């Protein structure tokens, strides 16, 4: 999805 979050995932591992 182009419109999905394109920033760092705040919940990344």
């Amino acid at each position: 999805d182009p419109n999905a979050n394109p920033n760092v995932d705040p919940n990344a591992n």
Epitope: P2, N7, V8
Partner: antibody, heavy 125, light 107 residues
Framework: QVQLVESGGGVVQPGRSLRLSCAAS????????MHWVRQVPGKGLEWVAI????????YYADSVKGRFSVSRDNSENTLYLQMSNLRAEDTAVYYC??????????????????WGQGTTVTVSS | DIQMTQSPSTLSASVGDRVTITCRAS??????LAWFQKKPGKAPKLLIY???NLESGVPSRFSGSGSGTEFTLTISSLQPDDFATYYC????????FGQGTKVEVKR
């Protein structure tokens, strides 16, 4: 203050290539998606490309697909737009635009928030 | 692809007027609509996001309404700083802009 400063615009002959740059400051550049948007004289604002924060995903408008490429260098806080096979319909002000930033990721669909002032590209012989 | 249409193209108004401008989407975009303000030769500024949510520092006199295909921006009492062109933008399916509404000084 979030600041985005485009550079690289100028005159370029039809069919040739030109690379634009955007110098980002006042936020963590490597955490933000980024966009290019243009405004051709006498036309509306036209989205050009997006690139993910980590460079892993990127999408283009049909009108530049196959000719333009977006990339970034997070270690230098710089966004790039490599243009090729330029034609008169590409004459425009090109803007660097930050994807909407949301540290809490509240919404599922993303727009854009802060714009640079633009760099002008003139495609002419 | 989704097309955005604004009306009117130009709105003549005076300081203190209530001003409403309209944006239509060719297909439903739910609440994924933004409003930007642009002055001549200057970068657009984001005013409203998620159709109705005012951005930080945006004055209380601005309001956005709508969900689906019909959207409005209202300025409850126009101020001198508000003469500008306003653009809507949908961010549901890629990103597309309306042609803009110029709010100009009435005389």
């Amino acid at each position: 203050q979030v600041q985005l400063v485009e550079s690289g615009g100028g005159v370029v002959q039809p069919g040739r290539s030109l690379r634009l740059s955007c110098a980002a400051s006042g936020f963590t550049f490597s955490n933000s998606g980024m966009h290019w948007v243009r405004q051709v004289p006498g036309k509306g604002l036209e989205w050009v490309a997006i690139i993910w924060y980590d460079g892993s995903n990127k999408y283009y408008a049909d009108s530049v697909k196959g000719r333009f490429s977006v990339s970034r260098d997070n270690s230098e806080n710089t966004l790039y737009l490599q243009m090729s096979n330029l034609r008169a319909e590409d004459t425009a002000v090109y803007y660097c635009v930050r994807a909407y930033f949301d540290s809490e990721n509240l919404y599922d669909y993303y727009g854009m928030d802060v714009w640079g002032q633009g760099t002008t590209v003139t495609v002419s012989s | 692809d989704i097309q955005m249409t604004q009306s009117p193209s130009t709105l003549s108004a005076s300081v203190g007027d209530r001003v409403t401008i309209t944006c239509r989407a060719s297909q439903s975009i739910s609440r994924w609509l933004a409003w930007f303000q642009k002055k001549p030769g200057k970068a657009p500024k984001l005013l409203i996001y998620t159709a109705s949510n005012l951005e930080s520092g945006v004055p209380s006199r601005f309001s956005g309404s709508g969900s689906g295909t019909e959207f409005t921006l209202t300025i409850s009492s126009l101020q001198p700083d508000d003469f500008a062109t306003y653009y809507c933008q949908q961010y549901y399916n890629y990103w597309t802009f309306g042609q803009g509404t110029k709010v100009e000084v009435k005389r």
